[PDB]
């Protein structure tokens, strides 16, 4: 399965509550932004966080999300 974990789910939603204006609906742009916003120890976690942040951003434009 592809269930994201809590270390990526809670860390991604802190970004939205803190840097929503600079975020976007594009993963490639989000991936570069999170490399200068957060100190991520591994490259794999950086893309995972931005990939779920993009999903939340894509979901926010359709209505209000829980936890943000």
């Amino acid at each position: 399965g592809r269930v994201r974990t809590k270390t990526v789910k809670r860390a991604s939603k802190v970004l939205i509550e803190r840097f929503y204006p600079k975020l976007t609906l594009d993963f490639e742009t989000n991936k570069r932004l999170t490399s200068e916003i957060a100190v991520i120890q591994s490259k794999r976690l950086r893309n995972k966080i931005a990939g779920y942040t993009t999903h939340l951003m894509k979901r926010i434009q359709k209505g209000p999300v829980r936890g943000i």
């Binding site: 270390t7 860390a11 802190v14 970004l15 803190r18 840097f19 204006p21 916003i37 957060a38 100190v39 991520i40 120890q41 591994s42 976690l45 966080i49």
Partner: protein
């Protein structure tokens, strides 16, 4: 003589492994931590880290002089080709080897286990360790043997970081009724690491909001 590359790097490792145990048996009472073999032209620098650098360098450095001679005569080295230095460990509390050797010298003095165990729990944490857990196994007056764990603080268990931020030391303690086995696991604080990673893999540090400025309609500031 002519030794292959595969067989030469292994020989250096085997030489280190045998040399390291030699210090553990000889300098056990001085809190021996580890040895560093710094090869250099025309010399073989060996750096030993011990809690007490007086027992090694005692009575006008007689023991260290008489100890380097035991290595020239066993490895067929030139008398000038090796130099041994004794260096004090900076943070004695962060070295599990020193803490395990120190505990053995207390257990062999008849001190109670609870008083001895808490003496290393607080000494490790006092030095700034992120976590520490001590397990002592064996037999004490009772015919049946038992083990007791003494944890404190934060400890990681799985994955690569245990190889990066945790050092461990096990020694056997010779008692009148049998052998006591002690394990001293010390996790150092990753923020103070100077060679490897400086944080745990899943530690995410989000920056602060730089926003909440006031925007003015449309001027131009010339220079």
């Amino acid at each position: 003589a002519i030794l292959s590359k595969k067989k030469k790097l292994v020989a250096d490792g085997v030489f280190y492994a045998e040399l390291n145990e030699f210090f553990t048996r000889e300098l056990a009472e001085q809190g021996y931590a580890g040895v560093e073999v710094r090869k250099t032209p025309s010399k073989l620098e060996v750096i030993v880290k011990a809690s007490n650098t007086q027992g090694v360098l005692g009575e006008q450095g007689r023991r260290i002089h008489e100890l380097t001679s035991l290595i020239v005569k066993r490895f067929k080295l030139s008398p000038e080709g090796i130099a041994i230095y004794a260096e004090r460990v900076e943070e004695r509390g962060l070295s599990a080897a020193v803490q395990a050797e120190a505990l053995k010298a207390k257990l062999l003095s008849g001190l109670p286990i609870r008083r001895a165990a808490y003496g290393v729990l607080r000494f490790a944490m006092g030095a700034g360790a992120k976590g520490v857990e001590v397990v002592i196994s064996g037999k004490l007056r009772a015919a049946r043997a038992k083990s007791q764990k003494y944890a404190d603080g934060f400890m990681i268990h799985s994955g690569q970081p245990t190889r990066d931020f945790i050092d461990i030391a096990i020694r056997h303690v010779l008692m009148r009724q049998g052998v006591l086995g002690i394990k001293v696991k010390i996790m150092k604080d990753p923020a103070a690491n100077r060679f490897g990673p400086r944080a745990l893999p899943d530690a995410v540090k989000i920056a602060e909001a730089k926003d909440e400025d006031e925007v003015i309609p449309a001027p131009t500031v010339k220079s």
